[PDB]
């Protein structure tokens, strides 16, 4: 729907999509006919809950500057904000419990005051599952394998 509303015959992005945390807004690429360098990623906002194309401020004219400098480097890195917690919610739904999830650290309140990281153990119930923070920050599900009666 966004591609159709933006105009043109086709606007689907080829290859991997580009996300940058500093920008905070999606990139839309529109092909240009009879020009070189005119095609560049523009900053757009997509609302998933709304489900329809809405234009804020009535800005029909494209952003000036010719080729935009904010979108010039291709990066293959894929990261999403911590508020998403897609894998955590999926694991919770697999367990069947939904609610506010709390993270803890393998520490002790004593004379020494220990502090050892316990990863992204952001769990709802008092039984705090151990979810492992990865090298790139990905939350990983470490569930021990057991052979049941089957």
UniProtKB/Swiss-Prot annotation:
Segments spanning the bilayer are none
Conditions for induction: Inhibited in nutrient-poor medium (at protein level).
Which N-terminal stretch is annotated as signal sequence?
none
* Subcellular localization, as worded in the UniProt entry: Secreted; Bacterial flagellum
Q: In UniProt terms, what function does this protein have?
A: Flagellin is the subunit protein which polymerizes to form the filaments of bacterial flagella.
Note in the entry: Individual Salmonella serotypes usually alternate between the production of 2 antigenic forms of flagella, termed phase 1 and phase 2, each specified by separate structural genes, fliC and fljB.
Q: Which family does it belong to?
A: Belongs to the bacterial flagellin family.
Name the record gives this protein: Flagellin
Q: What is the lineage of its organism?
A: Bacteria, Pseudomonadati, Pseudomonadota, Gammaproteobacteria, Enterobacterales
Question: Which residues of the complete protein appear here?
Answer: 205 to 354 of 495
